Amino acid sequence: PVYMVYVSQDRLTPSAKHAVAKAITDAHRGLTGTQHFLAQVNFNEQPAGNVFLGGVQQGGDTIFVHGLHREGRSADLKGQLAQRIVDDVSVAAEIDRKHIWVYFGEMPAQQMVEYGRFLPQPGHEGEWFDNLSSDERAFMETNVDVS
Amino acid sequence: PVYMVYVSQDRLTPSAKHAVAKAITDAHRGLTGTQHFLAQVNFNEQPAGNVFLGGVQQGGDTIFVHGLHREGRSADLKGQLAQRIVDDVSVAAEIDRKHIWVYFGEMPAQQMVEYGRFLPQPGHEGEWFDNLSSDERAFMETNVDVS
Amino acid sequence: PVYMVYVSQDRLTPSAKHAVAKAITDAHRGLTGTQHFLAQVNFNEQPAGNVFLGGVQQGGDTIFVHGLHREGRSADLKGQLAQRIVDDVSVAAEIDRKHIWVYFGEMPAQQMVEYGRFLPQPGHEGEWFDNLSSDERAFMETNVDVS
Predict the structure, then answer these.
(1) Does residue B108 belong to the interface with chain C, where contact is any CB pair within 8 Å?
(2) Least CB–CB distance from C55: residue in A36, A113, A117
(3) What stretch of H or E contains A107?
(4) What angle do CA A44, A82, C45 make, to 5 degrees?
(5) How far, in Å, CA of C101 to CA of C10, rounded?
(6) Number of domains in chain C
(7) Is the sign of the CA dihedral B56, C121, B26, A103 positive or negative?
(8) CA-CA distance, C70 to C68, in Å (whole number)?
(9) How far apart are CA A98 and CA C10, in angstroms?
(10) In which domain, by residue range, is B72 found?
(11) In CATH, what number is assigned to the domain containing residue B53?
(12) Looking at chain B, after which residues does the C atom sit over 2.5 Å from the next written N, breaking the chain?
């Protein structure tokens, strides 16, 4: 999955960004089973004042998380995932949940590429990884934080 | 809804951004009935020269509006909404409509979060808001511009 | 189509961006038949360190291509398109494919606007263009690079 996270300039310190990334990544891994290295958190920063709510320009305290996943999960699991991302980012970013927005977009796996290759159908990460060469596995494994 | 608006650096003044946000927000409210504070306009700015059309690098006069809505509206209402956003942004940004692109993405409400909570199924904004506490309502109401 | 391309600051030179745009644009045109001027490549740049994989902060060598298309193509054509974008960007950006991610989002044509007007249903670009005035055609034709 790829989580595009929209925030204002310097609202999240390098340290805060890592926490948020870990929170998002861990929540995903926990509720979906998908492997850590398969989840991306992309911070897109803009100047405070570029976000508008109901037409009222905001300050630097808004966070919009737009998640891109593979088709396949139930409404129940997605709801939990969303809820978990809200709680976890709230804590990780030290930001009240009222300031948090989250949208989930889904797509067919056969049209999703990570690490230059096609993702497996949900629940097949197993044989997908087994067929990979040790070079590609070693590379993917460098991208896992288990704190 | 969340309207991601991609434009070039300093093509829209703070003043022009507010106008556009109001135009987008008002159009949405008018054709969907959704409340003002429930609509977000997020300006994502990049240096002129980052947009390419047919392979030809552009200047600072392009605008791409990517709208994220809840599933449920008809093709007819969406078409009108899109058309309205084109006319209204054209006027608000003082930009010829030939320079305007608009895409609408839809998602199930049960996987969309605003103000830290789940959005209601279209046409239920009513009881959703009635169940909210006065603290959460007061907060949402600060984000409404009725000019 | 609109291809949002997320990269780190100064990882792609003006020259490299044009190559990538051409690669993306040409691949699209070749596998879909859609006209050059109808494809947009939008570079969204951020500071290196804003991308996280599995919770591990990355450097400036990641590329995420998020493509927005019209509903209608088969899984087979999309797969080929994706594969082609990976190979072609890899070459154009001089970046190993392991660093490349690609997602395709689809939407109904009747809710997609380019050059201020509604896109035609796939395979109708023909009469769509024939009904256009010479002013609008001349404008669109300036955005085509056939190198």
Answers:
(1) no
(2) A36
(3) strand A100-107
(4) 10
(5) 19
(6) 1
(7) negative
(8) 7
(9) 35
(10) 1-147
(11) 3.30.429.10
(12) none
